[PDB]
């Protein structure tokens, strides 16, 4: 449990050195559950990278910090943020990664309305990432708009893998209470063993974000909302009259209480709602630097 013991363990798996030897002008842009995110300038090129900083002493489960290393080493994809290097800097784990200059989807859903071409484009991109992760046994466990980042030209990428877990023939299900209350699958709140299906439920909640601006029960305390997710029928759109029958049918395959009956990522890639998906260009006008 010793802090210095965990520092030593992390040193054996990260890259050697200190990225301050090649980065300038750190500017904090976000705060997450495990640390902060900064932009930095590569001194040699003038290019911008992102740097995630996580204090080992502030982690509820320090061992989840290895998730950043496992994902960086073994899982790369068009719709997953690319991670370049990891370092131990003092008491902090620093991950130098791709900078997604378009910011997070949260800023869009809380400030503007997406049309279904844009919603389908986000869902297709997320589902392509999840289909590849799930096929290799990786569960993200924190799908929500805050975890979805954008490039300046509207490309959509999944980020924040600090909470993921792996399943396999020898470990078929996970049991840990991990996620963000309003987005958690009911079987996970019920403390039942769960699998990749919980990301599909969370994606459904994110679809409700994209239509309503906020997840269900967001006005309720997080523990109250979890009880309602667990005990009540699947949450409803507040604006059901504002979604096409195609979107509603899509959402109906995501927000299924029985995880055996929930659609998988591979199945959802074939759903007709995703035929509405626009190109990344259709997402560009939603971002702060472009909207009015």
């Amino acid at each position: 449990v010793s802090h210095e013991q965990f520092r030593a363990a992390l040193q054996l798996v990260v890259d050697p050195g200190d990225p301050r030897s090649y980065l300038d002008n750190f500017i904090k842009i976000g705060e997450g559950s495990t640390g902060i995110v900064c932009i930095a300038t590569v001194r040699s090129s003038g290019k911008l990278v992102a740097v995630k900083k996580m204090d080992l002493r502030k982690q509820q489960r320090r061992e989840l910090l290895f998730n950043e290393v496992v994902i960086m080493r073994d899982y790369q994809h068009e719709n997953v943020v690319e991670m370049y290097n990891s370092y131990l800097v003092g008491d902090e784990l620093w991950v130098v990664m791709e900078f997604l200059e378009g910011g997070a989807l949260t800023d869009i859903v809380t400030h503007t309305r997406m049309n279904e071409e844009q919603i389908a484009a986000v869902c297709l991109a997320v589902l392509q990432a999840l289909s590849v992760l799930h096929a290799q046994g990786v569960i993200h466990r924190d799908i929500k708009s805050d975890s979805i980042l954008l490039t300046h030209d509207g490309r959509v990428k999944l980020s924040d893998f600090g909470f993921c877990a792996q399943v396999s023939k020898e470990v078929p299900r996970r049991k840990s209470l991990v996620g963000t209350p309003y987005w958690m699958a009911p079987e996970l709140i019920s403390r039942l063993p769960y699998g990749p299906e919980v990301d599909i439920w969370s994606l459904g909640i994110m679809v409700i974000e994209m239509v309503d601006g906020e997840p269900p029960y967001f006005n309720e305390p997080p523990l109250k909302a979890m009880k309602m997710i667990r005990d009540n029928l699947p949450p409803r759109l507040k604006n059901l009259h504002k979604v096409s029958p195609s979107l509603k049918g899509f959402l109906d395959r995501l927000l299924v209480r029985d995880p055996a009956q929930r659609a998988t990522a591979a199945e959802l890639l074939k759903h007709p709602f995703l035929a509405k998906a626009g190109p990344p260009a259709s997402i560009v006008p939603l971002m702060r630097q472009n909207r009015t």
């Binding site: 997450g32 559950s33 924190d142 840990s176 209470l177 996620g179």
Partner: peptide, 9 residues
Amino acid sequence: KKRYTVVGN
């Protein structure tokens, strides 16, 4: 911090 991830006890 309503949007923050939680990790069970």
